[PDB]
Design a protein around this nucleic acid. Structure first.
Lengths: 22, 134
DNA sequence: TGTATGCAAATAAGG
DNA sequence: ACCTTATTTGCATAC
């Protein structure tokens, strides 16, 4: 149930790619 | 001007392959740009470049600097709070989530901690709350 | 022994 | 000189 204390990079190019592919 | 998407993932494998060619871990490439720019970027930052784990800007501000180091040859150090001050602080937060710049001074001093680091600790923390429990 | 990654400091930018 | 939101980095330690 760990909520994920900690911050993330928004729209990392990694995920930005897998998105504009399918 | 900074490249587009279609060019960033390309530089990604180029840098990875061409990196182990001259035998240099990402950690070394870090302290490498240290003696090349005025400061540097950790092994983590360089890692994230490879796996494309960075925003548009954060990677577009880096492609050019990274390519200089590869083409041709050649910030305050993070404060890590001891777990005993992390718990101590959690308590004062539990008493009041937003202390005045006065209280804050009176807390840092009351605990032998740089006033700034504390003013900041509460900031990041308040933001943390907002993320964790809405 | 190099590489990820979680958690989270530092910083950037508008008030 | 401080808060807020948004983000960039990076100890530390899990792979």
């Amino acid at each position: 149930a760990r909520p994920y204390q900690g911050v993330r990079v928004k729209e990392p190019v990694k995920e930005l790619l897998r998105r504009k592919r399918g | 001007e900074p490249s587009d998407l279609e060019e960033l993932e390309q530089f990604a494998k180029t840098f990875k392959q061409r990196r182990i060619k001259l035998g240099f871990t990402q950690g070394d490439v870090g302290l490498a740009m240290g003696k090349l720019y005025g400061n540097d970027f950790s092994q983590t930052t360089i890692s994230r470049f490879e796996a494309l784990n960075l925003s548009f800007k954060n990677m577009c501000k880096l492609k050019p600097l990274l390519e200089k180091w590869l083409n041709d040859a050649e910030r305050k150090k993070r404060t890590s709070i001891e777990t005993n001050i992390r718990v101590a602080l959690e308590k004062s937060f539990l008493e009041n989530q937003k202390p005045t710049s006065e209280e804050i001074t009176m807390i840092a001093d009351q605990l032998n901690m740089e006033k700034e680091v504390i003013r900041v600790w509460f900031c990041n923390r308040r933001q943390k709350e907002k993320r964790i429990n809405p």
